[model samples]
Target: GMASVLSAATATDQGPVRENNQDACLADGILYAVADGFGARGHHASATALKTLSAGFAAAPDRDGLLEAVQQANLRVFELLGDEPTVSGTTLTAVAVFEPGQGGPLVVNIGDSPLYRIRDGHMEQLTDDHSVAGELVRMGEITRHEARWHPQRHLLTRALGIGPHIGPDVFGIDCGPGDRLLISSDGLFAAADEALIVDAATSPDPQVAVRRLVEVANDAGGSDNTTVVVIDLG
Candidate 1:
C-alpha cells in the first residue's frame, strides 16, 4: 500500500498593465518553481531558466544538484543575451522536498520573488529578497511597507540569466504535516498585505488557495503579472 505524498496547485494572471505575461512557473510533481522576468526578452528568459532547472533536477534531485541546476539554468539563460545588451533577466524561486514525509523542503531563490511557510494560522517568509529595496529593508534602512513602493524596488541586486554565474540563496526549510508552502511573484505581495495572504492561503484546498490568492491580488489592483504555487504537505 502507498500513502499520499503532497498536493499542490498553481495560478497566474497578466494583470492590468502588462499585455504579456512575463511570469512563469513549474509545478513539476515534486519540484516547484516560480519566475518573474523583466525587459523585452524576459518572457523567454524566465521560461528557459525554469525549464533547464526542472530538467536538471529531474535527473539528480538533491541540494547539490539543486545548486548545480541553478548555475546551469543561469548559463542557458545567459546564452540568450549573447553580446547584445537588450536588458533581460528573471527572478527564480524554486523548491523541492528534501527528506520526504515529515521533512522540510529545499528552497532556492534568485531575485525578489519570495517563498513562504504557513502553519496553523501564522505565515512566515522563508526566502530573502535579492533587490535593492530588499537589502534596504533587511538592513533596517527602510520598513517592509516602504520596500513595497521604494524607487529601487524593481532593481534586483541579484537575478538569474544575468550572467554565467548566479549565486542563488539555496537552503532547506523545515515543515510539518498540514503545512502550506507558497511561492509567488511580486504582483501578489505588492498588491495585497500579509493579512490577505493568510486569509486566502489558509483555505483547505490547494486549488482554492491558489485561485483565491490570485483573485485577491487582481482585486487589490493587479498592476503586474501575478503567479503563485501553493503546495500542501500532508
Candidate 2:
C-alpha cells in the first residue's frame, strides 16, 4: 500500500566530545525509531532496546504491536539494568505507518528524544518530552525556550529501562505528500534550534537532509552522540 511510496534515511555519529556513540536509530519503510542511553551501561541499554524493538516490531507492525514491542524492550532493559530505578536506561521514541484504514501515523515516546513534523516549511514537535525540564514546561514553571538549554534538560523522568514497567505517550497525526518527519536524539535537538532543523529537514532528498542535520549539530558543538532519521511519505 502506501508503504511502497515511503522514503527515509538514518545517520548517527559520536559528537566531538563523546568518546562513543550511545544513540541508536531505525528506518525501514513503516517503522522508525531513535534512542539515547546513559549510565554505567548506557550504550548497551540503547543498542539492546532498539534491537529488541526491531525484532518484536517485525513480527507485528501495528499500533498494538508497537506497544507490545516496547514492553518487551522495557523488560529486556530491566534484565540489563534491573527492576530498581537506576541511571542505566535508554529513552525510546518511535513512529509507525500502516494500512490506510488504521490511521495516519502512530507515535510513541518515553524520553527526551524528539519527533518533528514539517509541512509547508513550518515545523512542530509531535512527541511529548519526558525529561524533568519537559515536565516543568508542562507545569508552566519554564518555557520551551528555557527547556532547550536547562541544566537538567537531559535528566529523563521516564525511560524504557529506568523501570520494570513502562507507559509511553502516544499520538496519531495526519501527514501527506511533501510533509517531512524527523526523529532525533537529544544530541541533535540540544545543539540546533528549530529553524536549523526545519531547513535541513526540508531538503528534497532525505539523505542530504540527514547529512546536513548531523553536520549542523556537530558545528554547533556536538556534546553527545547524535542520531537522526528523516522520513517522507508518497
Candidate 3:
C-alpha cells in the first residue's frame, strides 16, 4: 500500500465590518493548522491562538503531539490574556498527517469551526461542532435546521481563554488515495451546505473546488469571514 498527501487552505476577510481579521494558519513539517480568534469585539485572539499551536507543533514528539501542542498553545494564549487585559482568544481546528500507514490523519479541534470530507460524491463531516447549537443538535434537543438559525449558534462551550481545563476533541480516521478533506472557519460552511461542497470538490481542478466553495459562500450574502482548506490524498 502507498499514500501521497495533498492539502489546501483559504482565509478571507469579510467584505464589511470587522476591524481586524482574527484567523491564522501555520504549518511546519507534518503539522498543518488554522485557528480563528473569538471575542466580544476586543482582544488579539487570532495571534494568541496561532502562537500556542505553532509552539506546540514545534515541540510535539508523536501522533498525539497535536494535543500537547494545543495545550501548550492554550496556556500561552491565556498567559498573554492575563498579562494584557485587551486580548481574548480563538478556537482552533487542525490536522497533522502522521506517517502513511493504516493510520489516517490526527484531527484536533476546539470551538465551532468544521472539518469535512468528500469521497465518491458523498460528503461527511469529520469534526463535530463545539457550539451551543451544535450540542443541542447532538443531544436531539434541536434539529440541525434550528441549530443553524439558533440565536446562540456561535456560542462556544469550549475555547482557549474560556477556562484552564480545556479539552480538545481529537479524531483519527483512515486516509488513502482519492480522499478529499476540508477544514474551514465558520464563514465557508455557514453559507453553503455539504451537497454543494461535494459538487465543487469533484471538479476538474482542486483550486477550482476551492473557488467554487468560496463562490457559494459569497452567493449566500458572505455574512462572515470565509475560509477553506482542501486536502487530497493520492
Candidate 4:
C-alpha cells in the first residue's frame, strides 16, 4: 500500500489574552503539522511554514522528505522575515506516516511547541523543547517541573526564520494499533497539566478529543494561543 490508514482532528483558540491566533496546522493524507508563530508577524510566519511544507511534501513524499520540506519552510520564512527589525519567528512540530502502514512515525520539531504519543495508557513526549528552559534542563541547571514556570520558558533557542539553516530535531516513533499522537503549540500543554492532556486524548473520537483539550486550556485560564492535533492510528 502506498498510503497509510489514519484519522485526525484539529482545534485552535486565541486563548484569553491573544487577540489573534498565530497558529496553523495541516492534516494532509499522511502529513500532519502544527506551527506556532511568535512576534508581531507570527500569524504569517506560521501559515507560511505550513503552506510550504504541505506543498513541498506533495511534490516529494519519501523517508527523508519531511525534513527536506521543513528545511524549505525555514528558508522561506527567513526570507519573509528578512526585512523585519524586531525578533520574530515560528515553531514547527510535525509528523508523517511514512512507508505506508508499516514504518514508524516520522517526527520533526523546533522551538517550544511539542509532539507527544500515548500507548497502553502511558503517555510520553516525543520531542524536546528548543527553549532556554529546555537548555537549562539539559545542563541540569533546572528540573523539568521548575522549567515549566521559569520566566524564560518561552525564550526559544531555535526557531524558523531566525537563521538560514534551521536544523529541526527529526526522528521516528514506534507506535501501535491502540496508539495516539498529539501535536500542539505551547498554549495547550503550558496551561493544562499532563493528566488533563492524556485524558482528553484518550477519548474515542479525535474531534472530541481535540476540542476537549482546547477547552481544558481555556478553563485553566488560557494565557496564550493554543492549537492541537490528535491522530489515531487504529
Candidate 5:
C-alpha cells in the first residue's frame, strides 16, 4: 500500500490588544488556509471566508476549484457587510494538496497573509503582499528594511470583501517529502523574521513548529491578532 501523509498544524490568538479574534483557519484533509480580518465587521468576514472554503472545497480541491472557492469566499464576506462602508475585509492565503504529479499543492493568496516554502534548508516567500508598504518595496520606493517599519505598513491595498472583485494570486508547487509550507497572518511575520520562520518550519513536528511560531510572536509584543498554519508533506 502506498500512503501519503499530509500533516498540518494551526495556532491562533487574539494577541494583547484585540478584544476579539478576527482570524480564521482551516486544516481539513488536503486544504490549509489562514485568514486575517480587518475593520468593524472583520470578525464575521474572516469566519465566513473560512466556512465557505471548508464547505465548498471539502470533497476535492484542485487549482481551479480552490481559486473559485477564494472568489466565492470573497462574496460571502461581502454579503456579511452589505452596504456598510467600514472597510471590512480579510486577507487569505490557502494551499490545497494534490497528488505529486498534479503539480503538488496549489498556493493562492489575497492581501497580506503570506505563503512560504521551505525546501532543503532554503526558505522563500511564495506570494506577493498587497499592502501599501509591500507595494512601496516592490516599486523600489523603499527598501525591504524600511518597509518593515513604514508608518502605513498595516494599510492593505487589496483584500477580500473590501473591493468588488477578488484577485488572488494562484500558483502551484511540487513539494515532496521533507518539504514544508507555512501560511500565516502579518502578526507572525511582524513579530518574527524569515530566520525564525525557517527554523520553526524545519522542525520535525508540524504542531511544534506552529506553536513555536505563535509563542515567538507573542513574546515580541504581540500587538495584533496572530494566526498560522503549517503543512508538512510526507
Candidate 6:
C-alpha cells in the first residue's frame, strides 16, 4: 500500500530599506529552499545559489546528493565573485525531501535557515547554525542573549559557496501525521518571535498561518526581505 503525500510552501518579499527584494525561495515540494541574496554589481548571490540548488535536486535521488549540489553552488559562486568586479556572496539554507515516510522526514540544511519540529506543544530546533554567532554560543564563548546581539552575529562561518566544502546541518526527523517543519530566513526569525511561529505551525490552516507570519514581519518594520517555508508532515 502507498500513502499520499502533499506539501505546500509560500514566500514574500518587502523592499525594506533596500531598493529591491534580495531573497528567493524554491517552493516546489520535491525541492524546497530559502536563499538570502547578497546584491552586488553584476553578481546575484542568492539567485545563483538557488539556481544551482534547483538544478542539482532536479535529478537528485536523496538528501545526501544535495551535499554535492551545494558544493557546486559554492564553487560557482566563488568563481564568479573572484573573476567578476562584484565580490558578492550569500548565506544559503535549503531542504530536500527525498522520501517521506511515516517514520519521519529526511532533511538537510546549511547556514541558519532553520528547521523546527513541534510535538505535544513543545517546539524543537532540528538544525544547527553555521554562523560565528552559532559557534560562539556552542563553544560557550557567549551567552544565548549575547549571541543574539553579537556584532559578528551575521558572520556566517560556513555558507554554500564560501566554504571549502559543503557542511549542511543534516537530520532525519521523526515526524508523525501532525508534525510540522517550519523554515525561515533570518529576517523572519529575527523580526518575529517563536510564539508566533509555533502558533502558525499548529493552526488548522497552515497557509493562513504562513501568511500571518509574513504579515507580522512586514508590520515589524520589514527591516529585511523575509521568507518562510512551512512543511506539515501528516
Tens-digit lDDT string for candidate 3 (1-234): 544565554545553445556666555555666677766522366666766677766776466667787887777777667465454678788887776562557888898777777777776677778888989989999976577668888888877764567899988856567887777777766656756756876665667776787787777677766666677766
Encode model 4's per-residue lDDT on 25-136: one tens digit a residue. 8899888989999898999899999999999988888656777889999999989986799866799998887753435678888988888887887777778889988899
Candidate 4 stretches with Cα past 4 Å from truth are 1-5, 100-103
lDDT of each: 0.86, 0.85, 0.70, 0.85, 0.81, 0.67
lDDT of 3: 0.70
Residues 22-119, candidate 6: write the lDDT tens digits. 67777765567777766462136677887887887666746656767777788887776646654556666666554554223566666766667667
Clashing pairs in 6: 74-161, 177-234
- Regions of candidate 3 where Cα sits further than 4 Å from its true position: 7-9, 40-43, 83-87, 100-103
**lDDT string, candidate 1, 138-229, tens digits:** 99999877888888898899988887787889777777677889999988877677798789989888899999998888888888899999
TM-scores for all predictions: 0.93, 0.93, 0.85, 0.93, 0.90, 0.84
Error of 3 at 107 (Å): 0.9
Candidate number of the best lDDT? 1
Question: Measured by TM-score, how close is model 6 to the native structure?
Answer: 0.84
Worst 10 residues of 3 by lDDT: 9-18
Clashes of each: 0, 0, 2, 0, 0, 2
- Candidate 6 Cα errors over 4 Å, as ranges: 1-5, 39-43, 100-104, 140-146
Residue 216, model 4: lDDT of 89
Q: Tell me the alpha-carbon RMSD of every candidate.
A: 2.1, 2.0, 2.7, 2.1, 2.1, 3.0
